[PDB]
Design a protein around this ligand. Structure first.
Ligand code: ATP
Ligand code: ATP
Lengths: 118, 210, 239, 663
C-alpha cells in the first residue's frame, strides 16, 4: 500500500523473441553516458510548473473510468495513487524543461499505469 | 603538534597565572585566537586494491578551511605531508611491543572527484537546449540507457523517470505529503531483474546504496 | 600449526612473529609455509610470578610457491614444449585423478572449473560474470565426496568448509567489540579469504536457515556489502 | 620576563571606556527622570533582582552624541569584541552612584537582614579594634547584570551583532563574543546552589577568611594565616560555615538545530549553555526558543598531559531569553459568539476537521467525548466507570492516520503515540538508565502523564504481547501501576482511548466473517460501546467530487469552502471548559424512557442470534454507556433540558454507528 508500481516481468517463449536475444548477447563480448548524467543534473535545477487547469481536467476523467474499473477487476487503487498521477506527469514535464504542464504528458502517465495494471 | 613541521619544545600548560608582578592577571579573549581540529579515517577504494586483504585505513588532520566539506561517502583526494609524532620507547619503561610512531597526515586542499562541480560552457548548454527542441528525446533517452538488454521500455522509461525525481512542495504550517517516488519489481529468475540495478549506481550522482 | 602432525585428542596452538620490510608482504593467508629464525622472549605489561611470553623473530621465508607473476624462464620453456603436443585434453583426464575409475563426463568439468574464463569491464557500466559453477548430486558410494579433497591440494587457493553451512550469516562477515578502543571493525569471512580460487561445500538438503539467503547475493554479481553497525563497503569478490 | 612576554601597543585601552561609564551617570534625559536610575530604586528596596542594560539606552545615548564633536570611541564595537570584560568595570561604576538607604526594613520582611548588618558591624567595629581586611566586592551585591541586543530597524537606520546564526557556522572568530542562536532546548537539569563567596571560621578569632570562587574544583586553606587567631602557640582550627556563605542559582541545558536549516549532510550537534542571575526556571523541554548570550571556553583540568592536550569544549553563557509560540477573564466575548449564533450540532461539526469528504456522523461522535465531565460524584466507595472509548476500523486510502492524529494535536493534553517506542510495557512508567546524575528515576511512557485526556493510538497490531495487557489495564479502572521488583505503588487511570485497527491483507471482506483482523474478542464485544467503519464502495458521483477534492489543493494552496466560516480552536476549547463546569442532573422521565429503550434494545438483538454480521447481545454495559453519552451531550448543549428529546439525540447516534457494515 505504501508502494505504487508492481511490475511483473514475464518470460514468455517465442521463436522470434529468443532468436533475437541469442545474437545480441553474442554480439557484445568484444545517446552517451556522460552527457546523460549532465542532462539530469541540469534538470534538477530548473523550475517546477505544477500549474495548468487543462491537464488536471483530463486526468480526473482518466481516473474515474478506471475508478469504475479498479473495483470490478484486478486491483483496488486508493487516493494516494492520484498523487502518483500528478507526480509522474510532473517529472515528465521536467524532462521537457518547460514551465507549462502540457497535455501530452498526461497521455504517457495513463498509459504507463495501464501496462502496470493490465 | 599542529605547526606541521618544527618539533619545538612543548609547553605542557593550559593557562598561566601571576607573571612577575603583584598584579592579578587578566586575559582578553576577544584578542585570543583559536583554530579547530578534526580527524577523519580514509578507507581503501575497494576495486583497485587486489583481492588478498580487507580494506586498510589511515587518518588525516585538517584545518578550518576545508572542514564540513567531507560527507561520509565521497571520492576524496587529499594531499599533505607525511608525519610521525609521539615518543616510542622511552615515555614508559621496558616498552615491549608497543609502536610509538603514529602515522599522521597534516594536509590541505581536498577535492571531490567523480569516477556536483561540473561547470559547462556556453556550447554544451546550448546544444542541450537545441536537442530539447526535438519532440522525441524522451524516447531516445529510454533506448540509450541499458545497452545490453532488449525491450522493457515501460521499465526503461520508469527508471529515468524515477532517477530524475519529482518534487515535494512542503505545506506551510502543515504536514508535507509524499513527494518521493518508490518503484518495485518482481520476476521469475534470471530475467535481468538485478542487471539494471547495479548500473544505476555508476551514474548515481552521489547516491551510494547498500 | 599445520593440522596433521600431532593427533591424539588435542586442539592446535599459535605463536606470533615480526619481520623486516624487505621480506614483508610476501604471504597471503591460506598457504603451506616453512620458516627459520630465533626463539627470543619479550615481556609485555599488558598472572602469578613474573612470567613472559614466547614469540619468533623470523629471518627468511624460503617458502613454497605463492599458490605477482614473476618467475624464471626454464619453467615456461617446457610448458611451451608441452603445449605444442596436442594431446593435453585427453592426457589430463588420466593424469589428474590417479585414483578414480573413469567418470569421463565429470572429470572434464573439473579442469575447466579450475582455470575459468575472463572478466569484461567493457566500455559501459555493467559487467559479465566470467565463471562456472558445477554440482554433483547422486547416490552414496559414487565418489562425489573424496573427489573434492582432491581439488583442494591442486588448487592455488582453496578452502574446505564442506559441512553444515557453519552459521551461514557468519560465513561472509563478522564484526565484534574490540579490546582496544571498543570499536566495530571487519575481521572474518570465508569468501574474502578465498578469492581467485574455489570453495567447496556440501549438504544442500538440510540447510534451510540462511545458506540460501547468503549465497544469492554472493553469487551472480560477486559484490557484497555488509550493512552492519559500522561500515557499508563494497569489497571485491571473484569466487 | 623575557621571550615575548610584552605585547604590541594596542590603541584600544580600557581607561578611555572607564571614564565613559562615569558619564553613564545622570545624563540620559531623553528616556520619569533618569530612567535606568529609576530601575535602580526598585531593586534596593528588595523586590526584584534583575537589571536590564540594553543597547537601546546606548544607541540613543550615541544618537545625542552626534552633535558633540569630540573623540568618543564606539561602544558596540568593544562589547562584541570581548563581551565578558564588560561586567566587572561596570559594577565598579555603580557603587559610586548607588543610593543605599532608600528603603525601610525594620526587623523582618527581608531575608538575611539583621545578620548581614550584624556581620557588617562585626567587621566595622573590627576596623578600629587595635587600640584588617576590606570586603571583596563580591560580598555586598544582592543584584546581577544583564544585556540585550537589537535586531530592529535601528540596524537599518545606520551602522549586525544579532542576526540569528545557526550552530553550524559558529566555530570561527565567534569565540569570546555575544551571539544569539535559536534552537530546541533539551536535557533540562535541576537547580543547584553554586558558590560565589566563602566563610571559614576557626572558632578562636572569628575572622572569616573570604576568597573568590574559581572553577568547579578548589581547595580550602590552612589555619595559621589570619591576624589574631594565628601567630601564637595556639591556632584556631578552621572549618566552614553555611549561613554566612551566599549561594547562587545554576542549571544546565543543551540545544539542537531546527531540522530545516540543517544541510543535506551531517546530523546536527549539541551545545552547552548555563544560567546565572534570575533567568532560571524559565525554559522547558520542547521550547522553540532562542537565547542571546556571551561566549567563553573553559579549561578541562583533568588528565591534561597524556590526553587533553589543548582541547577546549566550550560553552556559551546566557544573557536573555526571548521565548516564542506559547474563564470570564476578557474572553467572554467569544463565548457569547457561540451563544448568540447557536449552531451546536452542525457548525461545530464542520469546525473540527473540515478537511475530509463526508463523514459528519463520525466527526460528531468525537466532540461529545472531548468534553467528558464527572460521571457521578459517588461519595461512597463505588468507583463507577467513566470516559467511554471509541474504536475505528477500515482501510481507506485517504491516509487515515492524519485524520485522527490531526484532531489529537489540537485537542487538549492529548498525547500522540504509535506502535514503535512506548510499547505496552513502556506505556506506563518504569525505571531505566540515566546519566551520571541520579539514576533509577521513574521514566514514563504515555498513560502516567496523559491522565484525563486523549490517548490517541495507532498501529494496533504492533507489539501486541505488551499492548494487549496495556489496553485492558486502562479499560479496567485504576490499576496503572509498576508491578516490578522496585516498588508496588499504583497510580490513577482516567483517560479515553481512540483506536484505529487496520484490517487483514487487502480489503476486509464484508461477505466474510468479521473479527478476521482484530485479534481481541473479549476486549471488544463487552467492554466498548460503539464502533464505526471506513469501507470503500465504488460510486461514480462521489469519487469525481473526491477527485476535484484532492486536485483543488494543488493549484492553489488553500482548502476551505462550502459556506462554513472557520472557527478558532480556542473558542470551542473555552466552550468545552465552560461546558465541563456545568454537570446537570437528570430528571425522572429520562430513566423512564430508557427502560423502554433497553427492552426494545433487548428484543430485536434476541431475534438474530447469528454469526453472519452482528455483534453484541444487549449488555447492560451498553445500557450504562448510552446514559453516559446522553449527559455528555446534555453537558455540551446545556439548556437544562434533560428530557426525552435529549436522549432522542443519543439513540440517534447508536443506530447510525451500528450497521455501518450493512452496505
Ligand atoms: N531478459 C534478459 N534480456 C537480456 N539479457 C538477459 C536477460 N536476463 C538475463 N540476461 C543476461 O543474463 C546475465 C545475468 O542476469 P542476472 O544475473 O541479472 O539475472 P537476475 O536479474 O540477477 O535474476 P535473479 O535476481 O533472479 O538472479 C546478464 O549479463 C544479461 O545479459
Ligand atoms: N570410480 C572410483 N574410482 C576409484 N575409487 C573409487 C571410485 N568410487 C569410489 N571409490 C573409492 O571409494 C573409497 C571410499 O569412498 P567413500 O566410500 O567414502 O565414497 P562416498 O563418500 O561414500 O561416496 P558418496 O560421496 O557418494 O557418499 C575411496 O577409497 C575411493 O577410492
Amino acid at each position: 500500500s505504501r508502494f505504487d508500481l508492481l511490475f511483473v516481468v514475464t518470460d514468455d517463449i517465442n521463436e522470434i523473441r529468443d532468436r533475437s536475444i541469442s545474437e545480441h548477447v553474442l554480439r557484445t563480448h568484444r545517446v552517451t553516458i556522460p552527457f546523460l548524467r549532465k542532462y539530469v543534473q541540469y534538470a534538477k535545477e530548473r523550475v517546477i510548473p505544477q500549474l495548468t487547469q487543462e491537464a488536471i481536467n483530463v486526468i480526473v476523467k482518466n481516473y474515474t473510468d478506471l475508478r469504475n474499473d479498479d473495483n470490478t477487476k484486478k486491483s483496488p487503487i486508493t487516493a494516494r495513487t492520484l498523487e502518483t498521477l500528478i507526480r509522474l506527469a510532473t517529472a515528465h514535464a521536467k524532462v521537457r524543461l518547460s514551465k507549462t504542464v502540457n497535455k501530452v504528458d498526461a497521455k504517457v502517465a495513463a498509459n504507463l499505469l495501464r501496462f502496470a495494471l493490465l | 603538534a599542529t605547526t606541521t613541521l618544527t618539533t619545538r619544545i612543548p609547553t605542557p600548560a593550559i593557562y598561566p597565572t601571576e607573571d612577575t608582578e603583584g598584579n592579578k592577571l587578566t586575559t582578553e579573549y576577544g584578542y585570543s585566537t583559536f583554530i579547530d581540529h578534526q580527524r577523519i579515517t580514509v578507507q581503501e577504494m575497494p576495486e583497485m586494491a587486489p583481492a588478498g586483504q580487507l580494506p586498510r585505513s589511515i587518518d588525516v588532520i585538517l584545518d578550518d578551511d576545508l572542514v564540513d566539506k567531507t560527507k561520509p561517502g565521497d571520492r576524496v583526494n587529499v594531499v599533505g605531508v607525511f608525519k610521525s609524532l609521539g615518543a616510542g620507547g622511552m615515555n614508559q619503561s621496558n616498552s615491549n611491543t608497543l609502536i610509538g610512531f603514529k602515522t599522521l597526515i597534516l594536509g590541505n586542499t581536498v577535492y571531490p572527484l567523480h569516477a556536483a562541480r561540473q561547470m559547462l560552457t556556453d556550447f554544451d548548454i546550448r546544444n542541450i537546449n537545441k536537442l530539447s527542441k526535438k519532440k522525441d528525446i524522451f524516447d531516445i533517452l529510454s533506448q540509450s540507457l541499458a545497452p545490453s538488454i532488449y525491450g522493457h521500455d515501460h521499465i526503461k522509461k520508469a527508471i529515468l523517470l524515477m532517477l530524475m525525481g519529482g518534487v515535494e512542495k512542503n505545506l506551510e504550517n502543515g504536514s508535507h505529503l509524499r513527494g518521493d517516488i518508490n518503484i518495485l519489481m518482481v520476476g521469475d529468475p534470471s530475467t535481468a531483474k538485478s542487471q539494471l540495478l547495479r548500473f544505476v549506481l555508476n551514474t548515481a550522482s552521489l547516491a551510494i546504496a547498500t | 600449526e599445520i593440522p596433521e602432525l600431532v593427533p591424539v585428542g588435542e586442539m592446535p596452538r599459535n605463536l606470533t612473529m615480526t619481520c623486516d620490510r624487505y621480506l614483508t608482504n610476501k604471504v597471503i593467508p591460506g598457504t603451506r609455509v616453512t620458516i627459520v629464525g630465533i626463539y627470543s622472549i619479550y615481556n609485555s605489561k599488558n598472572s602469578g610470578v613474573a612470567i613472559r611470553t614466547p614469540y619468533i623473530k623470523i629471518l627468511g621465508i624460503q617458502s613454497d610457491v605463492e599458490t605477482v607473476t614473476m618467475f624464471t624462464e626454464e619453467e615456461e620453456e617446457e610448458f611451451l614444449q608441452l603445449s605444442r603436443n596436442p594431446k593435453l585434453y585427453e592426457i589430463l583426464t588420466n593424469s589428474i585423478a590417479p585414483s578414480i575409475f573413469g567418470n569421463e563426463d565429470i572429470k572434464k568439468a573439473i579442469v575447466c572449473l579450475l582455470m575459468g574464463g575472463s572478466k569484461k569491464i567493457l566500455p559501459d557500466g555493467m559487467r559479465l560474470r566470467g565463471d562456472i559453477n558445477v554440482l554433483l548430486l547422486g547416490d552414496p558410494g559414487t565418489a562425489k565426496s573424496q573427489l573434492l579433497k582432491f581439488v583442494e591440494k591442486v588448487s592455488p587457493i582453496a578452502v574446505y568448509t564442506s559441512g553444515k553451512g557453519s552459521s551461514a550469516a557468519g560465513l561472509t562477515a563478522s564484526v565484534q567489540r574490540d579490546p582496544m578502543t571498543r570499536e566495530f571493525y571487519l575481521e572474518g569471512g570465508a569468501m574474502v579469504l578465498a578469492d581467485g580460487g574455489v570453495v567447496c561445500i556440501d549438504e544442500f538438503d538440510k540447510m534451510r536457515d540462511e545458506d540460501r539467503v547468503a549465497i544469492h547475493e554472493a553469487m551472480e554479481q560477486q559484490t557484497i556489502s555488509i550493512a552492519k553497525a559500522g561500515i557499508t563497503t563494497v569489497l571485491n569478490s571473484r569466487t | 620576563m623575557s621571550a615575548a612576554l610584552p605585547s604590541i601597543q594596542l590603541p584600544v585601552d580600557y581607561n578611555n571606556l572607564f571614564n565613559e561609564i562615569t558619564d553613564f551617570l545622570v545624563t540620559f534625559k531623553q528616556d520619569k527622570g533618569p530612567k535606568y536610575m529609576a530601575m535602580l530604586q526598585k531593586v534596593a528596596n528588595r523586590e526584584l533582582n534583575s537589571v536590564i542594560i540594553d543597547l537601546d539606552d546606548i544607541l540613543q545615548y550615541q544618537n545625542e552624541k552626534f552633535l558633540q564633536g569630540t573623540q568618543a570611541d564606539d561602544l558596540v564595537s568593544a562589547i562584541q569584541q570581548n563581551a565578558n570584560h564588560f561586567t566587572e568595570l561596570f559594577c565598579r561604576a555603580i557603587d559610586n552612584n548607588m543610593p543605599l538607604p532608600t528603603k525601610e526594613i525594620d526587623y523582618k520582611d527581608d531575608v538575611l537582614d539583621v545578620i548581614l548588618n550584624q556581620r557588617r558591624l562585626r567587621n566595622e567595629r573590627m576596623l578600629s579594634d587595635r587600640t584588617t581586611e576590606l570586603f571583596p566586592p563580591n560580598l555586598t551585591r544582592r543584584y546581577f547584570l544583564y544585556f540585550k541586543p537589537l535586531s530592529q530597524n535601528c540596524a537599518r537606520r545606520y551602522r549586525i551583532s544579532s542576526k540569528p546564526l545557526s550552530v553550524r557556522q559558529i566555530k570561527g572568530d565567534f569565540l569570546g563574543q555575544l551571539i544569539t542562536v535559536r534552537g530546541i532546548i533539551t536535557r533540562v537539569s535541576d537547580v543547584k546552589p553554586a558558590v560565589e563567596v566563602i566563610a571559614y571560621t576557626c572558632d578562636q578569632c572569628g575572622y572569616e577568611v573570604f576568597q573568590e570562587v574559581n572553577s568547579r574544583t578548589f581547595t580550602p586553606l590552612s589555619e595559621c594565616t589570619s591576624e589574631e587567631c594565628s601567630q601564637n602557640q595556639t591556632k584556631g582550627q578552621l572549618f566552614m560555615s553555611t549561613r554566612a556563605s551566599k549561594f547562587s542559582a545554576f542549571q544546565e541545558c543543551k540545544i539542537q538545530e531546527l531540522s530545516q536549516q540543517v544541510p543535506v549532510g551531517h546530523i546536527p550537534r549539541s551545545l552547552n549553555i548555563h544560567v546565572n542571575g534570575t533567568l532560571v526556571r524559565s525554559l522547558s523541554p520542547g521550547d522553540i526558543v532562542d537565547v542571546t548570550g556571551i561566549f567563553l571556553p573553559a579549561p578541562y583540568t583533568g588528565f591534561k598531559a597524556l590526553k587533553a592536550g589543548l582541547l577546549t569544549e566550550t560553552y556559551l553563557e546566557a544573557q536573555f531569553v526571548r521565548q516564542h509560540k506559547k474563564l470570564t477573564s476578557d474572553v467572554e466575548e467569544r463565548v457569547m459568539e457561540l451563544i448568540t449564533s447557536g449552531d451546536v450540532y452542525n457548525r461545530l461539526a464542520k469546525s473540527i476537521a473540515p478537511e475530509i469528504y463526508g463523514n459528519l456522523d463520525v466527526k460528531k461522535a468525537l466532540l461529545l467525548l472531548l468534553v467528558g465531565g464527572v460521571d457521578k460524584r459517588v461519595g461512597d466507595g463505588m468507583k463507577i466507570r467513566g470516559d467511554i472509548n471509541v474504536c475505528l476500523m477500515g482501510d481507506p486510502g485517504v491516509a487515515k492516520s492524519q485524520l485522527l492524529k490531526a484532531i489529537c494535536k489540537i485537542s487538549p493534553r492529548g498525547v500522540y503515540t504509535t506502535g514503535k517506542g512506548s510499547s505496552g510495557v513502556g506505556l506506563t512508567a518504569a525505571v531505566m538508565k540515566d546519566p551520571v546524575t541520579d539514576e533509577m528515576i521513574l521514566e514514563g511512557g504515555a498513560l502516567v502523564l496523559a491522565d484525563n485526556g486523549i490517548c490517541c493510538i495507532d498501529e494496533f497490531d504492533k507489539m501486541d504481547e505488551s499492548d494487549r495487557t496495556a489496553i485492558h489495564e486502562v479499560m479496567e479502572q485504576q490499576t496503572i501501576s509498576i508491578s516490578k521488583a522496585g516498588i508496588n505503588t499504583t497510580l490513577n487511570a482516567r483517560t479515553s482511548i481512540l483506536a484505529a485497527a487496520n484490517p487483514l491483507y487487502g480489503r476486509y471482506n464484508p461477505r466474510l466473517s468479521p473479527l478476521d483482523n482484530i485479534n481481541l474478542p473479549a476486549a471488544l464485544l463487552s467492554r466498548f460501546d460503539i464502533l464505526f467503519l471506513m469501507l470503500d464502495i465504488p460510486s461514480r458521483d462521489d469519487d469525481e467530487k473526491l477527485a476535484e477534492h484532492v486536485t483543488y489543493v494543488h493549484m492553489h494552496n488553500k482548502q476551505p469552502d462550502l459556506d462554513f466560516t472557520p472557527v478558532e480552536p480556542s473558542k470551542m476549547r473555552e466552550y468545552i471548559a465552560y461546558a465541563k463546569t456545568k454537570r446537570p442532573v437528570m430528571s425522572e422521565a429520562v430513566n423512564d424512557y430508557v427502560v423502554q429503550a433497553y427492552i426494545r434494545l433487548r428484543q430485536d438483538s434476541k431475534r438474530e442470534m447469528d454469526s453472519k454480521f452482528s455483534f453484541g447481545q444487549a449488555t447492560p454495559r451498553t445500557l450504562l454507556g448510552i446514559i453516559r453519552l446522553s449527559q455528555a451531550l446534555a453537558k455540551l448543549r446545556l439548556a437544562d433540558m434533560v428530557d426525552i428529546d435529549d436522549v432522542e439525540e443519543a439513540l440517534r447516534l447508536v443506530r447510525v454507528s451500528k450497521e455501518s457494515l450493512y452496505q
